[PDB]
């Protein structure tokens, strides 16, 4: 169901390549008709409310999409309810035979496993979670317990659930003994890496995404090119230049992606320009990547332009350590930067102490400040120490 959530997000807000909305709208209409989900055709009305590039034309004539009618009707709804009532009749016929038999704990749990898949495919969220809790306690081992988490993670990625899904994610991880189990490792590192995306941890995102076991590729939730897509974005923050030439540029998993998928280009244009520290080539590849990567992805476009500010902060630090004193017009004719607009670009960092760059407005030259010292490092202990003493006084006076 990767293309189900992808094409549904493309119809929310798209400021670039409006032609992709046609292939996205025509896909979600043919996918719901071929599936059993009733409400996901109705959710298109509420989910797109107050969004640029509206996909719904009823009272709003400002819709810029190519397919302007997502409107819900009773014609398709009644047809989807017939497939739901016909399938539950076959399952209840088998469950009734299982209740009268009751052979082991696997067949008793399999009755709820078939329901856990049924209630997930008919569009129920809380009703499906109630069915998954019954099969979790009746499981004979950890093999049937992790399949419960797979359905929880399926409904959690569509509705963006950071609480119930994250709690059950670490529950299967801990249990009694973890071990080297492939299911409790490969699946955990990929799903927990997706949860780190939305919260932007960046500490475990580089290790659990840029470094993957082999291909992942379950095809049910996320795909192969998606894991490599976030790897290029998250690999530019925590991973320094030492790991860029090992797990990024020289990574064997990213060598065959260039000749396979050419629509990404985030592992070449961004990596080569940063490794060579050339601002001339690095600038035009920012908007080309921003359009075809950040915007289409669901966990990226929520932030978007903030990443442009953070990615440009990386290249400013690469040049700052390469010189002490430099003229402003030198990088203008070489790296293709505007002198008049350079002060406004660097004005979002230097006063916030994000960069050590110092530009002299008299002669038009840039200098370099001290990158690190003992004084700037003790300031982190001041804010961390004062913030810790608050809990000691708060919890100390609360208990009495």
């Amino acid at each position: 169901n990767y293309e189900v959530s992808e094409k549904a997000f493309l119809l929310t807000q798209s400021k670039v390549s409006i032609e992709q909305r046609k292939e996205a709208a025509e896909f979600v209409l043919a996918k719901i008709k071929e599936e059993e989900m009733a409400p996901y055709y109705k959710y298109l009305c509420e989910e797109y409310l107050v969004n640029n590039g509206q996909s719904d034309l009823e009272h709003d004539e400002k819709s810029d999409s190519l397919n302007e009618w997502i409107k819900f009707d009773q014609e398709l709804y009644n047809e989807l309810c017939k497939k739901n009532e016909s399938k539950i009749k076959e399952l209840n016929e088998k469950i009734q035979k299982l209740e009268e038999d009751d052979e082991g704990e696997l067949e008793q749990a399999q009755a709820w496993i078939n329901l856990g898949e049924y209630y997930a495919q008919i569009g129920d969220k809380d009703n499906a979670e109630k069915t998954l809790g019954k099969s979790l306690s009746k499981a004979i081992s950890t093999g049937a317990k992790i399949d419960v988490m797979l359905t929880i993670a399926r409904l959690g990625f569509f509705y963006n659930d950071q609480l119930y899904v994250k709690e059950k994610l670490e529950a299967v991880n801990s249990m009694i003994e973890k071990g080297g189990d492939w299911e409790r490792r490969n699946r955990y590192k990929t799903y927990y890496g997706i949860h780190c995306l939305a919260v932007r941890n960046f500490k475990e995102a580089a290790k659990l995404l840029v470094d993957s076991l082999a291909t992942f590729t379950s095809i049910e939730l996320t795909s192969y090119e998606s894991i490599a897509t976030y790897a290029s974005v998250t690999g530019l923050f925590t991973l320094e230049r030492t790991d860029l030439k090992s797990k990024v540029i020289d990574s064997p998993e990213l060598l065959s992606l260039i000749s396979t998928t050419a629509a990404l280009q985030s592992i070449s244009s961004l990596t080569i320009s940063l490794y060579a520290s050339d601002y001339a080539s690095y600038f035009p590849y920012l908007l080309e990547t921003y359009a075809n990567v950040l915007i289409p992805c669901k966990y990226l476009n929520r932030h978007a332009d903030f990443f442009v500010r953070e990615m440009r902060r990386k290249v400013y630090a690469q040049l700052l350590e390469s010189y002490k004193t430099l003229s402003l017009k030198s990088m203008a004719s070489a790296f293709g930067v505007s002198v008049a607009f350079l002060d406004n670009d660097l004005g979002k960092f230097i006063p916030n102490k994000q960069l050590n760059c110092v530009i002299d407005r008299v002669n038009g030259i840039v200098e370099t400040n001290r990158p690190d010292n003992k004084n700037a490092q003790y300031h982190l202990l001041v804010k961390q120490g004062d913030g810790l003493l608050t809990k000691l006084q708060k919890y100390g006076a609360a208990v009495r």
Binding site: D305, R309, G336, S338
Partner: peptide, 27 residues
């Protein structure tokens, strides 16, 4: 999140391509 994590800039978005244009023209 707050500060520039949300508001960010909201300026010079589509004008980045104009910087390369003015460099290849006025040259």
């Amino acid at each position: 999140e707050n500060w520039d994590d949300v508001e960010v800039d909201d300026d010079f978005t589509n004008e980045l391509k104009a910087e390369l244009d003015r460099y290849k023209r006025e040259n």
